[PDB]
């Protein structure tokens, strides 16, 4: 089972691993009040806290180019949480997940359902390779993930898995956050008609 079968805005599924295997986790974000700020909870280590700062800065910049009239990330007091509360978590691979959670919250739009992602985020939005792709992918498949987004340089790790694991997985290998944004929010890049 999963902690969220259906993600509302501000909630994105990420992927973690330990020496004991892989798991899914959800990044949760929310307002704490009507210059902004980010408060972060979830027993995060120092690499993960820094990846939340990087993601926060990039998301502010990304959404000032995609939606300059939208100030929600610049002015709001945001809270970011990664359950479960007692479990320690660390590492950079949730960067894109955090970016997506913040944009999802600021746009008031949920991300594509049954989607998980992992990837380190650069300050300019480059997606850097991560560890545990095999364990994270198995965990996604067990959790009902149908769409998985991974750093492009982790492609060989993904295809080291047996076919019966990756069959049925729609996989996207990405290098810049813009590619994730268009998978996560397909209606922001979809064919439209005027009336
Ligand atoms: B990602 O690989 O950076 C990811 C980020 C986020 C999903 C937590 N981090 C991990 O998957 C961590 C989880 C963790 C758990 C407890 C304490 C620290 C980190 N795992 C690893 O970094 C890791 N797992 C197995 C073997 N080596 C390292």
Curated annotation (Swiss-Prot):
Active site, per annotation: 93, 136
User: How is this protein annotated for GO cellular component?
Assistant: cytosol; membrane; mitochondrial matrix; mitochondrial nucleoid; mitochondrion; nucleoplasm
Q: Which GO terms describe its biological process?
A: cellular response to oxidative stress; chaperone-mediated protein complex assembly; mitochondrial DNA metabolic process; mitochondrial genome maintenance; mitochondrial protein catabolic process; mitochondrion organization; negative regulation of insulin receptor signaling pathway; oxidation-dependent protein catabolic process
Intracellular or extracellular location(s): Mitochondrion matrix
Task: Name the predominant localization.
Answer: mitochondrion
Q: Does the keyword Mitochondrion apply?
A: yes
Entry keywords, A to Z? ATP-binding, Cataract, Deafness, Disease variant, DNA-binding, Dwarfism, Hydrolase, Mitochondrion, Nucleotide-binding, Protease, Serine protease, Transit peptide
What tissues express this gene product? Answer: Duodenum, heart, lung and liver, but not thymus.
Provide a Gene Ontology MF annotation, just one: identical protein binding
Known partners and oligomeric status: Homohexamer. Organized in a ring with a central cavity. The ATP-binding and proteolytic domains (AP-domain) form a hexameric chamber, while the N-terminal domain is arranged as a trimer of dimers. DNA and RNA binding is stimulated by substrate and inhibited by ATP binding. Interacts with TWNK and mitochondrial DNA polymerase subunit POLG.
Similarity comment text for this entry: Belongs to the peptidase S16 family.
Per the entry's comment, what about the domains? Answer: The Lon N-terminal domains are crucial for the overall structure of the protein, maintaining it in a conformation allowing its proper functioning. The AP-domain (ATP-binding and proteolytic domains) has a closed-ring conformation in the presence of AMP-PNP and its N-terminal entry gate appears closed. Upon ADP binding, it switches to a lock-washer conformation and its N-terminal gate opens.
The condition associated with this protein in its record is:
CODAS syndrome: A rare syndrome characterized by the combination of cerebral, ocular, dental, auricular, and skeletal features. These include developmental delay, craniofacial anomalies, cataracts, ptosis, median nasal groove, delayed tooth eruption, hearing loss, short stature, delayed epiphyseal ossification, metaphyseal hip dysplasia, and vertebral coronal clefts.
- Name listed for the protein in its UniProt record: Lon protease homolog, mitochondrial
According to its UniProt entry, this protein's organism is Homo sapiens
Question: Which gene is the coding source of this polypeptide chain?
Answer: LONP1
Question: Which stretch of the full sequence is covered here?
Answer: 754 to 957 of 959
């Amino acid at each position: 089972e999963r902690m969220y079968d259906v993600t509302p805005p501000g909630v994105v599924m990420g992927l973690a691993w330990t020496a004991m295997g892989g798991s899914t986790l959800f990044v949760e974000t929310s307002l704490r009040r009507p210059d902004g700020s980010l408060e972060v909870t979830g027993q995060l280590g120092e690499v993960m806290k820094e990846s939340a700062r990087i993601a926060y800065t990039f998301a502010r910049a990304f959404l000032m180019q995609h939606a300059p009239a939208n100030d929600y990330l610049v002015t709001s007091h945001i809270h970011l949480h990664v359950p479960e509360g007692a479990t320690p978590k660390d590492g950079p691979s949730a960067g894109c997940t955090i970016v997506t959670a913040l944009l999802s919250l600021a746009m008031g739009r949920p991300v594509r359902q049954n989607l998980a992602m992992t990837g380190e985020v650069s300050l300019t939005g480059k997606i850097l390779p991560v560890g545990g792709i095999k364990e994270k992918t198995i965990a996604a498949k067990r959790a009902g993930v149908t769409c998985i987004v991974l750093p492009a340089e982790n492609k060989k790790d993904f295809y080291d898995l047996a076919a019966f694991i990756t069959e049925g997985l729609e996989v996207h290998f990405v290098e810049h956050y813009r590619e994730i944004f268009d998978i996560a929010f397909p209606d922001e890049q979809a064919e439209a008609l005027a009336v």
